[PDB]
Subunit: 310 residues, 4 copies
């Protein structure tokens, strides 16, 4: 079916007919590189490096020509070249490489003769320094992003409705597949249904907050163990008189979990959704925590998504 | 007209007669570079590099002189120089460059003869290492800033007043021109009018909070689609008995949207304003979202700022 | 005994039977390196470097062979090698090293003859650049983590119950063993007891918030001096009719302190716990702050954990 | 007088008799370097670099000896050294330098003869790479800290009491000496008085929150202009029946301003204090904002701290 958020939590919209997109991306380069695909990113990385090399190699070759350093121009024995041992565009590129990387073997070096050569080298160096810096920074950040981290936190596949403490509650389960901690986490659902007009031309989406509680309905400092989040279905509930039955109803229960990560201080956001068909009536998550002889608690994720009837 | 915040959200104040500004900027160098103009920043970048080069080149030339390494001083065949192949200030600069960048060709190298040369090189290296680090860090950060990001979020051009759910509401529209998400966003307006005294000498600006609501008047986790923010004009409203009519009134409705960015964990703040003349009476934003055959929602920004009369 | 959080605040759970763990770690490499053990991390660091070296050395040796550059292949005096001075896998590795580190002595350099050599070098450079960057970034971050910082903040060893301002209060003490400040700190306890079912197969842990107050029960901006945190044991208390006596009761009072660090803007979280046996009845922390002639306050941590009876 | 926080906002406590301080600092190296003095930090920076150089130079000299590479050991014309052109501890150090920095001139290079030399070089490289990284990271961060930034935000020198809107209010003034913005700022005062016991042995400090309001008593998104913060002295006030008169009373009004910075996403905290003597009765900050012909507001900091009587 059509849905707001993919079951794993990826965006499910496209945008169209943005005027002046290109210029706007050119202004905000940094973000544009951080958000770009990986293929084109690798390509741009390698191209930056080797293409700066190549361009400056052609440039150095031209400087050589204009000064006649080439061999079969028949330079006199008097002739000090603008650069040493450069008489082919190949060696030109090779010197571009040796100097810009700063490998600097020493079989080709600059000579005191040509000043334009000197300034040209300084320019090459400064610019390529800049570009190296920029690209490496974007690459660092694009790895560092915590989206990918989100995958090691998992919602239940199914939401289930039953009597908890005598109150009708819709229940979901969350867990963390790593030892590193999430902190300051908070669960907040939104409820999103369908409003059709005159036409299939437009839709107004009416959001409704749904809050989810654990103990005091506040937040949970640490997501130590698979946490059971439940929401009160009483007349305060925007869900109350939904068609509570099997399958029918035109809605989506978007679920959001936002909280800080321990080792990076980044805010990390997991998302997923529940369809009217995905919700189950009168069911009980098999408790997924058991204790062991060595003395502390075990989270066995074979039962995480298991349910049985009440 | 005079305004608090430029329509795009840039500061519109100047400060004057700050005593001891210069020293204060010299203390806080880091921020001072991060906040400085780009031109002077590039200039300072290149100058740092090449001027360290130049200074140490002069220094090396002097060391050469004091040791008589120059050629037409007629050094005996006995003579080991403080440095090899340095007999001109040109080569001096060239060695400064080759060592400080660590290009190190090898046609000019240090010799074991002069110890002062050695310490001098170590100093050059350590200091220039420091400066390189500092400047590159400031450059990284100054790119990374999220102000520029703010431009890819856009407020409506016009605020419009009408009956929403039967309540008189002032309405604005927001949207995001990129696929990357904003999170934890919150809209808060302030109301700023004009208080004149005895003189044109001074003014007290009285702020008044105005809150803006969407569904529950709480916040919206994600800015997926162009969001309609509305404020209740009832007697709780600081706007209530403003001259609600066309144009007149001496005020500014400053609008602020603050929230975390997904890919960087940075807090991002958009701002703009509304003048008494910019506000429109009895108008309806054409709904800007439509659905498509492939199945999910389209945000067509040609209608974003479009209105028609109710 | 079995406990939730180790007395110092380390996690005390294991997870089991995670399906598809390996692929999931391969997706999220960055975090996986940041969270990995130090031994394997050093190993992987050094291996990256020297093994890239070694692989490309073998590669260069092969290029040499295919071009017959080896000596006892008896290369004619006509013969320009793909690389200079490479006729042994040893020198191959040595050139890999000299170029990839960019040490570039110059006794072995590339020649204009073989283009495949050139592209091969460019590839070596680009890839090894990438890997260097990644590993150094993960290493930086893994140092930077503030967990280790947490150890310089210390809870009391014992929680003690007595009449503070006439109200029965459970009391703990916190302190900071460094001059650097913590800011925005907030103390929040959870109460965790034991719910057994039919079987030793599963357990539901019921959390209950416990709030801890100092002056106004709000938060404390700065943790200047050893702070006494106390909780009101009245009928609002989830502790109220616990077996308040010596030792008995099946619970754990988990204590959490979350707040921003000054010099890094990182959020820092200390944790520890209290067992039913660790709690003491009718006791008074000896006040740990005294003033001195030079004029300001001294925090003497010999008394920090000292108590005497009321 | 004795005070909690220095008028500018520096900590005014010392800690004493911390057991196991040294080991604890050795665990948390990163923070320990970030928090250490600048002198010792520069010293440690330069020492790391040049001392790694020096140690490995001695090491290389020893390898030379053990292989007899020294000249006046009279090496036969047959003799391939472990290293080229190294026959003095001086050149040893020079090669340490040329390789570890990767300056690599080429007058001294390694030869294929000695494998131990090779591994030794690889080790030198890897370790020194590590250390370089660590130190540069700590240096970056230690600059980046926003404490120093705090100095460009200034509280009033004097707190003043008077009738604002008819309510008795204690009033202070804040301002920002830079164009860069602070965001999400919040002012919160604490009130700290003196509780003496039996002895001059100990003191319990009782904190009391004091909230400070501007318009709605909420927070102020941006600190555009010098902001007047006022607190309501009515019977809700912990200040209410203080000795409201000149000078007397044994207290300190600690003032805290916490908020995010624009260009770095760092949280920035300004602090200062007010003594019972520093507070003034019946006084009015001269309004410090005036408008100008060019059209927008001017903050003239000559009047910032000026007052006159009501
Ligand atoms: C290093 C590295 O990451 O290279 C990635 C590589 C090439 O990039 P690739 O063409 O696949 O582009 C990625 C692809 O679009 C993913 O689907 C995106 O994540 P998502 O689905 O939208 O969520 C991802 O964006 P983000 O996740 O980075 O933001 C894109 O980068 O992917 C393959 O292995 C293709 C094998 C065929
Ligand atoms: C790289 C790079 O960014 O170079 C910028 C370059 C020179 O710098 P430039 O003189 O223009 O200085 C920039 C200019 O003042 C902008 O207006 C500022 O933004 P805003 O208006 O106040 O909002 C900006 O500050 P910030 O945005 O960085 O903070 C300033 O840096 O600008 C041109 O292309 C001039 C073409 C003629
Ligand atoms: C540099 C550097 O840090 O090397 C560490 C080194 C080898 O690593 P090592 O085998 O000990 O692995 C560490 C060990 O597991 C610790 O116990 C972990 O902390 P914790 O106990 O779970 O809390 C730590 O994880 P984290 O703290 O980094 O996250 C692990 O890295 O440790 C020794 O000195 C072994 C001496 C025998
Ligand atoms: C570069 C660089 O910063 O060098 C600093 C340099 C040497 O360091 P220095 O001995 O002064 O040590 C600094 C001094 O203790 C300051 O007072 C400290 O700040 P504060 O007072 O406690 O607040 C500062 O700590 P932090 O501010 O960095 O945290 C310390 O680093 O200081 C001089 O110019 C001495 C001139 C005689």
């Amino acid at each position: 079916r059509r849905r707001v958020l993919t079951k794993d939590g990826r965006s499910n919209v496209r945008m169209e007919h943005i005027a002046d997109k290109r210029f706007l991306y050119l202004k905000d380069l940094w973000t544009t590189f951080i958000d770009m695909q990986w293929r084109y990113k690798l390509l741009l990385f390698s191209a930056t490096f080797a293409g700066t090399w190549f361009l400056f190699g052609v440039v150095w070759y031209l400087v050589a020509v204009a000064h006649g350093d080439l061999l079969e121009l028949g330079p006199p024995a008097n002739h000090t070249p603008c650069v040493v041992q450069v008489h082919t565009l190949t060696g030109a590129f090779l010197f571009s490489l040796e100097s810009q990387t700063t490998i600097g073997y020493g079989f080709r070096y600059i000579s005191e003769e040509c000043p334009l050569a000197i300034v040209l080298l300084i320019a090459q160096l400064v610019l390529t320094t800049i570009l190296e810096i920029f690209i490496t920074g974007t690459f660092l950040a694009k790895i560092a992003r915590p989206k990918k981290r989100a995958e090691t936190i998992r919602f239940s596949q199914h939401a289930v409705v039953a009597y908890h403490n005598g109150k009708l509650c819709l229940m979901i389960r969350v867990a963390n597949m790593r030892k590193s901690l999430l902190i300051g986490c908070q669960v907040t659902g939104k409820l999103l249904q369908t409003h059709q007009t005159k036409e299939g031309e437009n839709i107004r989406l009416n959001q409704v907050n749904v809050t989810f509680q654990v103990d005091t309905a506040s937040d949970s400092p640490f997501l130590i163990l698979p946490l059971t989040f439940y929401h009160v279905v009483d007349e305060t509930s925007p869900l109350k008189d939904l068609p509570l039955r099997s399958g029918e109803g035109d809605f989506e229960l978007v679920l959001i979990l936002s909280g800080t990560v321990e080792s990076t201080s980044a805010t990390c956001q997991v998302r997923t959704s529940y369809l009217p068909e995905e919700i189950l009536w009168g069911y009980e998550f098999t408790p997924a925590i058991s204790l062991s002889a060595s003395g502390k608690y075990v989270a066995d994720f074979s039962l995480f998504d298991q349910v049985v009837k009440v």
